[PDB]
Amino acid sequence: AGGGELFATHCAGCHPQGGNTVHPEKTLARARREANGIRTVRDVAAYIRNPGPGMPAFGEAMIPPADALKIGEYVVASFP
């Protein structure tokens, strides 16, 4: 699913079935994404850039921001 092909390689290895392999308390569930407030496409492009501890990072070396706005979508076809 375009963005899925990317998320299923640069995320799949940590975000298996909208799950987590590091933190079993921080899922992609809106219920949670709401508390922190992460229910947007952009948000799912910037942070990824320079996110906090626990999660790696993704510069414009491999995946360009413009290509990130495409990923944010993948996270809007299951649990916006």
Ligand code: HEC
């Ligand atoms: C393990 C090496 C990870 C990879 C690869 C990716 N993410 Fe991640 N993600 C990870 C953790 C441990 C957490 C919990 C938050 C923390 O305190 O670290 C998360 C959380 C998210 C969330 C939910 C909250 C948020 O900050 O957005 C989202 C939406 C998210 N992660 C997105 C995401 C994407 C799009 C990734 C591939 C580009 C990706 N993550 C990789 C661990 C890991």
